[PDB]
Amino acid sequence: LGEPRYAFNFN
Amino acid sequence: MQAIKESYAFAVLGEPRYAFNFNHFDYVNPAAPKGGQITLSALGTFDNFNRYALRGNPGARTEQLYDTLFTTSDDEPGSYYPLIAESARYADDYSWVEVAINPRARFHDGSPITARDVEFTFQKFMTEGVPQFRLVYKGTTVKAIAPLTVRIELAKPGKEDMLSLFSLPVFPEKYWKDHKLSDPLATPPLASGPYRVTSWKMGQNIVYSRVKDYWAANLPVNRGRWNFDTIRYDYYLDDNVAFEAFKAGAFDLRMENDAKNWATRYTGKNFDKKYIIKDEQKNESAQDTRWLAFNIQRPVFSDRRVREAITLAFDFEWMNKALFYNAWSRTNSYFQNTEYAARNYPDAAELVLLAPMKKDLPSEVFTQIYQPPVSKGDGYDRDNLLKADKLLNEAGWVLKGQQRVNATTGQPLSFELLLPASSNSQWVLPFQHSLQRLGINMDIRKVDNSQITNRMRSRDYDMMPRVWRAMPWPSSDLQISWSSEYINSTYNAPGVQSPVIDSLINQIIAAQGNKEKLLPLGRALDRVLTWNYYMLPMWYMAEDRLAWWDKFSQPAVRPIYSLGIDTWWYDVNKAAKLPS
């Protein structure tokens, strides 16, 4: 909820 | 006069559940005892401790090292309650807020968390953070106006943009002044949350210890949570060795994502003696979905007809019956199992949104309900494979002998499927075989967890599997995954830059916090993303399949939006009955 605004994608 | 409100809780849509007399959440035991260890698995590897860097494979749980201004409940889609903040004063349009900082808030070294740390943190993300941050918050300021009061000003109304800053980690300036946010960390940073990293072995394990004097242990949001003294993560290179280690007792809890394991392999001494508990519960909430991304920036997948034909070759009904004990449901929406999924014909409100862009839309947006291909269930569906051939021929990919080649150039039709080595991928040879029967060559490349992370981030693939996380309403975060200006965010899996998508998402942002406008906007966007075949839909299950060694107790209520493992506690009487 905002997380894609402050960190790159990671699986 | 402009109206100024003061509140202790917020919700993205509607009113917060815990707005009055909030002592603790409904899904905790406030008297849960402290103590004991839980041991968990992780797949792949890790190489650093900075979740916010521009590169690296960050450790398990390194997104939870820091407390935030407000924290969310797990039984609501988007509701915020006090953590570092006590309260906020705000404009009616949420274009400014003044947040009051708790004077008891502390970092792990016993130093205070202040308004200056919040101002510092915002500048650190704007100058050294991932590139999307300074684009989203262009025009926003964050200023310490008193020792314990921080003022946020937006250049536009943005309720959701404000709430998103309530989830930012609050960094200690005294540590982070000496470390660039963009660089990986070999050692844990100075932090603040209820667990601290106390030991590790790079690539192999991380151990978290409970902070026993944690300043916020008695706040309502923390009562009944963070009960274990120790949380340990052990890394496994693939899911088969992880499953066998679980059954041998090497770790305590497993989320079962493999249908054959659940159906046939929960057997043996440890199940007979009831040392291991198996639990299946229906979930009626927004659902994570699996897809295969097409890289539409590569020539092989630039034509919608070729993406449609490759989708027809994927025989889901055969895989579900022959391989997966009919366990799975087909993915069919970017708002799966919500009111925002476009599962009926468009209504008048959707047609006002879509009609002006008719020249740039597939005709079926207006005439049909999106349905992924359905087969008889035998691997040789004549109608679907004949339709695939028809579309390939129209796109200029024709048979010469047994191989498909470009009708102009003679080049064979070929692509690479990029896979994590760690995954169960029983569906991959069946899909390769179907494509070979159409004259299409699919090479398979399995790579380690560092390589898959680097190549996923740079879009260095033709096709790769992606998870689309549950999105319970059409959020302003959609811009990061789909809008043209955010193409390099690492969240745009197909590489799409479309003015149609951009227009609908701009209209969703303008409707932030308004459900009656967001219903037709979400359904209209679902139709554009599905009918363009940007990704190949796989599957989901609206059931949570969990198993655990019988050493735990749980509250009577499970939250809706998470499994609630942070509410569990170590049960010394149950634990006493297990082998030592």
UniProtKB/Swiss-Prot annotation, chain B:
One of this protein's GO BP terms? Answer: microcin transport
Asked if the Swiss-Prot or TrEMBL record annotates the protein with the keyword DNA-binding, the reply is no
A single Gene Ontology CC annotation of this entry is:
membrane
Q: Does the keyword Signal apply?
A: yes
Domain of life assignment: Bacteria
Q: Which SUPFAM superfamilies does the UniProt record give?
A: Periplasmic binding protein-like II (SSF53850)
Pfam families linked to this entry: SBP_bac_5
For this chain, one GO molecular function annotation is: peptide transmembrane transporter activity
Q: Which UniProt keywords apply?
A: Signal
Cite the InterPro entries for this sequence. Answer: Peptide/Ni-bd, SBP_5, SBP_5_dom
| Regions crossing the membrane | none
Family classification: To H.influenzae HbpA.
**Name assigned to this protein:** Uncharacterized protein YejA
Q: What is the source species?
A: Escherichia coli (strain K12)
Q: What gene is this protein a product of?
A: yejA
